Amino acid sequence: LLAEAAKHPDMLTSVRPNGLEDTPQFKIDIDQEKAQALGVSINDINTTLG
Amino acid sequence: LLKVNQDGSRVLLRDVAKIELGGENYDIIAEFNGQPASGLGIKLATGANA
Amino acid sequence: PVDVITAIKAQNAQVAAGQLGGTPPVKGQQLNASIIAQTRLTSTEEFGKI
User: Fold this and answer.
1) Chain A hits for B2, Cβ within 8 Å
2) What contacts B11, CB < 8 A, 6 or more positions away?
3) CB within 10 Å: which end of chain C, N or C, has fewer?
4) What happens when the gene is disrupted (chain A)?
5) Which alpha helices (H) appear in A1-50, and where do they start and end?
6) Chain C contacts of B20, Cβ < 8 Å?
């Protein structure tokens, strides 16, 4: 929509979003099996992290 | 994952229970002309707004 | 006193225990009745023998 709306500058202008665009994020995959194997509590993990 | 056997085995949720996209409650079944259907019963706030 | 408290919260409670063949049922069920488990206590004597 934002691309097609910039091709009609004769009856429409300044077509833009108001929010924000996608940003990089950091995913931490908590392997559950290894967490149980090593004998750590998942609650401990999430609590420490947060 | 539910538990890990010292054998080295693995006990998944699918191995003890059916996983199924169901409903919250199964008490309510609606039929239009016999044919299975759903619907919306609309009440009226005390203070119509006719 | 903690042991007493917990013993009260354990032996004097009202638990939800579903129904005998509630919804959903297998096809052809002819019996549907609610199930009673632990109910509240009602007298001095009842708390007496906790």
Assistant:
1) none
2) B1, B2, B3, B4, B5
3) N
4) Loss of susceptibility to contact-dependent growth inhibition (CDI); inhibiting cells still contact the target.
5) 32-37, 42-49
6) none
| Strand B35-37 to B30-32 pairing | antiparallel
The resolution, in Å, is: 3.6
End-to-end alpha carbon distance in chain C: 14
Give yes or no for a contact between B19 and B13, defined as CB atoms under 8 angstroms apart: yes
Report the alpha-carbon distance of residue B11 to residue C16 in Å, rounded.
29
> Counting one residue from A and one from B, how many pairs have CB atoms under 8 Å apart?
7
Grouping H, G, I as helix, E, B as strand and the rest as coil, residue C50 is: coil
Cβ contacts of A3 within 8 Å, gap of 6 or more: none
- DSSP 8-state secondary structure symbol assigned to residue A48: H
User: Given the DSSP bridges, would you call strands B10-11 and B3-4 parallel, antiparallel or unpaired?
Assistant: antiparallel
Element containing residue B11 per DSSP (H, E): strand B10-11
| Helices and strands, counts by H and E, chain A | 2, 0
Experimental method: X-ray
Return d(Cα B29, Cα C24) in angstroms, integer. Answer: 11
Phi/psi for A17 (5° steps) reads -80, 165
